[PDB]
Amino acid sequence: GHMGITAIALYDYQAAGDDEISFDPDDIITNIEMIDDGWWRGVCKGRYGLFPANYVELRQ
Ligand SMILES: [Mg+2]
């Protein structure tokens, strides 16, 4: 419900810093904020931070 904008990971991503998150393919990213065109912010598996926008696919 209150998950905001959500997406599915298209690829593996390893956080390059403590301000980034990591995810595996098919993981769900929620509460997405599109703070810029290349990098978004959201929640994945209880972690909060930045990730590359083109590594995910928006749901609906
Ligand atoms: Mg991984």
Swiss-Prot record:
Q: In which tissues is it expressed?
A: Expressed at intercalated disks in the heart (at protein level). Expressed in most tissues, except in B-lymphocytes or plasma cells.
The UniProt comment on domains reads: The SH3 motif may mediate binding to the cytoskeleton.
| Subunit composition and interactions | Part of a complex composed of NEDD9, AURKA and CTTN; within the complex NEDD9 acts as a scaffold protein and is required for complex formation. Interacts (via N-terminus) with NEDD9. Identified in a complex containing FGFR4, NCAM1, CDH2, PLCG1, FRS2, SRC, SHC1, GAP43 and CTTN. Forms a complex with ABL1 and MYLK. Interacts with SHANK2 and SHANK3 (via its SH3 domain). Interacts with PLXDC2 and SRCIN1. Interacts with SAMSN1 (via SH3 domain). Interacts (via SH3 domain) with ASAP1 (via Pro-rich region). Interacts (via SH3 domain) with DNM2. Interacts with ACTN1. Interacts with FER.
Q: Which cysteines are joined by disulfide bonds?
A: none
Natural source organism: Mus musculus (Mouse)
The record's function comment reads:
Contributes to the organization of the actin cytoskeleton and cell shape. Plays a role in the formation of lamellipodia and in cell migration. Plays a role in the regulation of neuron morphology, axon growth and formation of neuronal growth cones. Through its interaction with CTTNBP2, involved in the regulation of neuronal spine density. Plays a role in focal adhesion assembly and turnover. In complex with ABL1 and MYLK regulates cortical actin-based cytoskeletal rearrangement critical to sphingosine 1-phosphate (S1P)-mediated endothelial cell (EC) barrier enhancement.
- Please state where this protein is localized: Cytoplasm, Cytoskeleton; Cell projection, Lamellipodium; Cell projection, Ruffle; Cell projection, Dendrite
Q: Where is the SH3 domain?
A: 4-60
Please give the name of this protein: Src substrate cortactin
Q: Give the signal peptide as a residue range, or say none if absent.
A: none
Q: How is it modified after translation?
A: Acetylated. Phosphorylated by FER. Phosphorylated in response to FGR activation. Phosphorylation by SRC promotes MYLK binding. Phosphorylated on tyrosine residues in response to CHRM1 activation. Phosphorylated by PTK2/FAK1 in response to cell adhesion. Tyrosine phosphorylation in transformed cells may contribute to cellular growth regulation and transformation. Phosphorylated by PKN2 at both serine and threonine residues in a GTP-bound Rac1-dependent manner in hyaluronan-induced astrocytes and hence down-regulated CTTN ability to associate with filamentous actin.
Full-sequence portion shown in this chain: 490 to 546 of 546
